[PDB]
Amino acid sequence: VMKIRMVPISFVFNRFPRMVRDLAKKMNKEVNFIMRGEDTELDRTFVEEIGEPLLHLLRNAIDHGIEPKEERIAKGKPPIGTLILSARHEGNNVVIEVEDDGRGIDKEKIIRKAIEKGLIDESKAATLSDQEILNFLFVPGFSTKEKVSEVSGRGVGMDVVKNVVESLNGSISIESEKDKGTKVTIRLPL
Ligand SMILES: Nc1ncnc2c1ncn2[C@@H]1O[C@H](COP(=O)(O)OP(=O)(O)OP(=O)(O)O)[C@H]2OC3(O[C@H]21)C([N+](=O)[O-])=CC(=[N+]([O-])O)C=C3[N+](=O)[O-]
């Protein structure tokens, strides 16, 4: 129409609490799930396809993000991990993000695999801002772990999220730091 419907993101959110409660037990990892800005509004269109994205994001964080208990106090922190999902008003843009206080992705290691395959050389590397070094997992086929047979019929390249985000004219950023955690943003229009 010529009048799009804005709805609270509250709707797409209230669903996660329970799935996080499952992925938590499923992986035996008590995760303290926290949701903020639940009263933000976003186009009814976005709302629909926006569930899987954030979902995958929570999925990674609860699986790969949070670590088990002494690995945490041994690292120096609370036994219980914290997964924070949020969304506010930034200009005319709805900024959503999934912060976890995780283990976090390691940026030089990526280069070790991104280089052990050639999308960059030694020299470039020194010009890749932390952002660019991470944008790499956006590359279709970037994790070359799964490939020969253990290639299970399904999956979702972290690009389907840059797809679901790009089908939407969205933009995602990734900020990590070894053993502190990982913060992934998804800036959207309207
Ligand atoms: N929120 C998150 N917290 C932690 N890890 C996350 C997160 N989100 C996505 N990941 C990526 O997911 C991988 C899972 O890490 P870990 O749980 O120790 O091992 P898994 O073999 O069980 O995972 P897999 O089943 O291969 O996805 C890591 O692989 C890598 O970056 C990590 C990784 N790493 O953790 O060091 C290095 C790497 N390269 O290339 O060097 C590529 C990854 N990757 O592609 O996913």
Swiss-Prot record:
It is found in: Cytoplasm. Disulfide bonds: none annotated. The gene is cheA. Transmembrane segments: none annotated. It comes from the Bacteria. It comes from Thermotoga maritima (strain ATCC 43589 / DSM 3109 / JCM 10099 / NBRC 100826 / MSB8). This is Chemotaxis protein CheA. Residues 1-190 form the Histidine kinase domain. Involved in the transmission of sensory signals from the chemoreceptors to the flagellar motors. CheA is autophosphorylated; it can transfer its phosphate group to either CheB or CheY.
